[PDB]
Amino acid sequence: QCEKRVFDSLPSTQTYLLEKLKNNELKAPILIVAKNQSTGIGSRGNIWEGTKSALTFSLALNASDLPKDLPMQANALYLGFLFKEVLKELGSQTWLKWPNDLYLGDQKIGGVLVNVYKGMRVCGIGVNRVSKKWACLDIGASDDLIIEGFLKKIEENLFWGEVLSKYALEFHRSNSFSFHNDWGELVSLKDAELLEDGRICIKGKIYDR
Numbered sequence: 001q002c003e004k005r006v007f008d009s010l011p012s013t014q015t016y017l018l019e020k021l022k023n024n025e026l027k028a029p030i031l032i033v034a035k036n037q038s039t040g041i042g043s044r045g046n047i048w049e050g051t052k053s054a055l056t057f058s059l060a061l062n063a064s065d066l067p068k069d070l071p072m073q074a075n076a077l078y079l080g081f082l083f084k085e086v087l088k089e090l091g092s093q094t095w096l097k098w099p100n101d102l103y104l105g106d107q108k109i110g111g112v113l114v115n116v117y118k119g120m121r122v123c124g125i126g127v128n129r130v131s132k133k134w135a136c137l138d139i140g141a142s143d144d145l146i147i148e149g150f151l152k153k154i155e156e157n158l159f160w161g162e163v164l165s166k167y168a169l170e171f172h173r174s175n176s177f178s179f180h181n182d183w184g185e186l187v188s189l190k191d192a193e194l195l196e197d198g199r200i201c202i203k204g205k206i207y208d209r
């Protein structure tokens, strides 16, 4: 498998990895783990807060490492769904709320973030393990076990077509919830319908993230 670097603390594994690729100091595939993040990044430049114990890493892939039929807009959905299936095989009840959120019950415990740079895809995943502020993962699997499973699910190289069909079975759970559009405004998923490229339509309007 691919090299892993583990830091006790970084501002952000995503920022670290992106800047190393931009400077041509690393090459995909490579995996970057921070035991603690001090300036984690969510979606839309929101903060992803560090908990007492959290799983936070970023994984750089080459396009060739992903299905040929995977649209760029579906990156977070595809990698997020595989991560969730890794969690489910380890006994977790975690589910994927559209577009890229890891939920337990009806509370967010983690999220997926994909940045694209020169055809390389930088997948950043955070999941709370221990915290008094936020909900946490419902299993005890080591971080190494979760990440190894993740690398293997990616390695199975399933068509995007297959993965979305699995997710389409559970999209409906998202209908009770909402997401933030590009301008930060809450939008209900009640009437949202899934599209074959991972986007949704709500009464004739298409959304992505």
Ligand SMILES: Nc1ncnc2c1ncn2[C@@H]1O[C@H](CO[P@@](=O)(OC(=O)CCCC[C@@H]2SC[C@@H]3N[C@@H](O)N[C@@H]32)OP(=O)(O)OP(=O)(O)O)[C@@H](O)[C@H]1O
Pocket: 011, 012, 013, 014, 015, 037, 039, 040, 041, 042, 043, 044, 046, 047, 048, 049, 050, 051, 055, 056, 057, 058, 098, 099, 100, 101, 108, 109, 110, 111, 112, 113, 124, 125, 126, 127, 128, 134, 135, 178, 179, 180, 181
């Ligand atoms: N610890 C916490 N637990 C629960 N909730 C928390 C929280 N900290 C803040 N919150 C609240 O969660 C909202 C903001 O999260 P978010 O913008 O993005 C994401 O999930 C992407 C996460 C990817 C991080 C990984 S870590 C390893 C890489 N390096 C790093 O730098 N990036 C990646 O999603 P969102 O809330 O806007 O919801 P919708 O998708 O439904 O619109 C907001 O509420 C906030 O208070």
